[PDB]
Design a protein around this ligand. Sequence first.
Ligand code: NA
Ligand code: NA
Ligand code: NA
Ligand code: NA
Ligand code: NA
Ligand code: NA
Ligand code: NA
Ligand code: NA
Ligand code: NA
Ligand code: NA
Lengths: 170, 170, 170, 170, 170
Amino acid sequence: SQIRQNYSTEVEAAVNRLVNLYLRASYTYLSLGFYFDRDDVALEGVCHFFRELAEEKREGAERLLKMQNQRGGRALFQDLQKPSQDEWGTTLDAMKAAIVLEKSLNQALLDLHALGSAQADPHLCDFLESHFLDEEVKLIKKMGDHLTNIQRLVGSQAGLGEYLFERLTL
Amino acid sequence: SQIRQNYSTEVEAAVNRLVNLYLRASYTYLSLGFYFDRDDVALEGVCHFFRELAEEKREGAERLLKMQNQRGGRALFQDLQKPSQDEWGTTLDAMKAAIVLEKSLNQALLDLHALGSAQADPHLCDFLESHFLDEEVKLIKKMGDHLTNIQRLVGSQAGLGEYLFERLTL
Amino acid sequence: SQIRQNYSTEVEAAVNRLVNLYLRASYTYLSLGFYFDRDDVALEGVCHFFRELAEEKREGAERLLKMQNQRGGRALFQDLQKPSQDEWGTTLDAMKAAIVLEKSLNQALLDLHALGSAQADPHLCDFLESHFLDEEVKLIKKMGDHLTNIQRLVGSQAGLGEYLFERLTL
Amino acid sequence: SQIRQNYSTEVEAAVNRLVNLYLRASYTYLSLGFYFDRDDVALEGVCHFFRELAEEKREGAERLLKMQNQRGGRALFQDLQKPSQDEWGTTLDAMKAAIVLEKSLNQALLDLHALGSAQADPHLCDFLESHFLDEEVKLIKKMGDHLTNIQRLVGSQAGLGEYLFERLTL
Amino acid sequence: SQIRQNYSTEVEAAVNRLVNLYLRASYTYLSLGFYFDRDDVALEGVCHFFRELAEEKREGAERLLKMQNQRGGRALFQDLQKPSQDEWGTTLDAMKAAIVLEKSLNQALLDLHALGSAQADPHLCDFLESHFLDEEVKLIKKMGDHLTNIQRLVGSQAGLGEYLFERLTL
Ligand code: NA
Ligand code: NA
Ligand code: NA
Ligand code: NA
Ligand code: NA
Ligand code: NA
Ligand code: NA
Ligand code: NA
Ligand code: NA
Ligand code: NA
């Protein structure tokens, strides 16, 4: 490109891989949201928590694609793998799956930041620090808080606890 | 001082000791608040209850220092001891620790009032009656109410009760 | 912690030490503020300058503790040493002490940033760059400006100059 | 009186003496205010500081007379002695005279409070604590602050300092 | 040009030289403004006085370039010489340098007006009378007033005077 400066082919490829990862995560959260809308599951606040995450992760992919074109890189899309499960269990199982997925996104962000640092690409480092790394730490902390609250509610009356969480936290 | 009148060295020293006690209590409540913000504890209303108490106790120290200078006494600061615990247990354990601490502050206020009375210092007596003694009785009553509500919630489903208290009272 | 990722024990400990340093600085500024409120000192703008700094440094400690829990580290509080002086001299002496203290906080921030960089912790580096390093440079520049203005006012009429500074700058 | 209860003849007489003292102080401050309005003195902020104090002390006398009738005591007025000086010197001399006068009022208030306490008259004790003792401590602290600021301004250019104080503090 | 009428090559060249002179003066005032923002100089009102002059002189250059194109002349830019000093001394030294610079701009304006008059170019004469000559006389009078006020403040307490000027005039 006429505009490309200081933007390695390694970073360009890793940004494309990260876009795939974010779109995969959006699709996983779409599947989690619609599972909680099942008439035999029926946890509306859980459905809305995951549907909002699906939108967030799509928006993160769109911001990475915007940056890829601002740097003069070329977006390359790959197939999007289906989510790992078709049914997601309890709200506890689902929130455990969600923190595993967000940990994996965070590790991908950290790996890209490290690549950027090795390539002396400060605009990439800044972009990630500014729009991704703190949002991901904040999200992971929120999920961990949720996770602890769900766990303390299981006790010996798991249905009751699952209802309450949904009603009073989500 | 040019302005000092009717202000004994005994009262001056005891006001400095009370400032230390209030600042110690602010620090204890800061530690309690951040313990309830842990991802493995995650009781937001409990965190906010103690963080608000940390601010109150700091403000009480600042009011005592203001009065010390209005009387012509001299503020003398000492080291502030760390809180008694690093981890605070359950919300019940924490509220028991908080009432023990507020009882000890109240006894210090009563002891200063008695000193004032023995020194015939009515401005000191009035200052304490006006800004401290009723606030402390009101706080201790609120903690005792909380304490009773937490206790009735333990039953055989302690996690559930701890969640509910947090959600519906705090 | 379930949420901890990329957060070294070295950084965790250094954040706890920095919290102690910020709380120590808040306590120093509380002592400076109340010294200028003495009836025999009576520099209201000087008192308000330091009282505002006490609040800032407390808020900096609270932000570090928030981040410590967002990363899955554990807050550990230590005793808070009393300020270095009981009486702080002239406004010049006090502003010299304040710049020495802010230089020492800045060096602690830089040392933590360096640790973060050695540990490849970009979220820590970003957090410090975002909330601490520019605020500290801005503060140190303001104190240096004050310092120069106080110095030019001493001349042969130090009382007059101290009054004027207080009245017309603070 | 039909309404008198728990109100000793000693307290009644001492309240009448305190009314005389407050009215004397109002008259002293009237003389101080008009001295600073002299064309050969011409310190407008000093004049307004003392004129406001004249009004305060008159209002304090009126509140004591109101209380005397609410208790069923009988107001008895005596001659009001002229102020101690006809010309009041510098603003420093005048503020020294004003703090001497306020110290003497405070000692009279404390003496009445002690009498009340010896007579087991809590309504009198409360009335003084509520409307007089803290106002007098606040005033004496303000005068002491002023006093320190005037003193630091004398230096070797006393006229300049007196102008500045008036202009920038009062 | 198709539009050029009554616009001599001598005037065209002198307008280009005047643009250089105005841009040089803008750069001088930028250097003066940032010198007064030094932490070891720290005269904020002095910094703002010169920074505003830097903007004025840039705007004067832009108005001359606008007029050059409205007449069908051709802008020709030359190198811009650095300011005459790197450090500017006291506010007195700086205001003396500023009046020397404004006198030199005024003499350049008068010389161009004279050229215009010799070339019978009334649109040029009007343009200068309308947008430059009275603004320059007003500015030079303001600087001279400042200069007199700074001079009366030096006395035997130059620091004090420099502070006061900055605080109370600028
Ligand atoms: Na939405
Ligand atoms: Na951005
Ligand atoms: Na609050
Ligand atoms: Na009060
Ligand atoms: Na504030
Ligand atoms: Na932030
Ligand atoms: Na009035
Ligand atoms: Na009343
Ligand atoms: Na401007
Ligand atoms: Na025009």
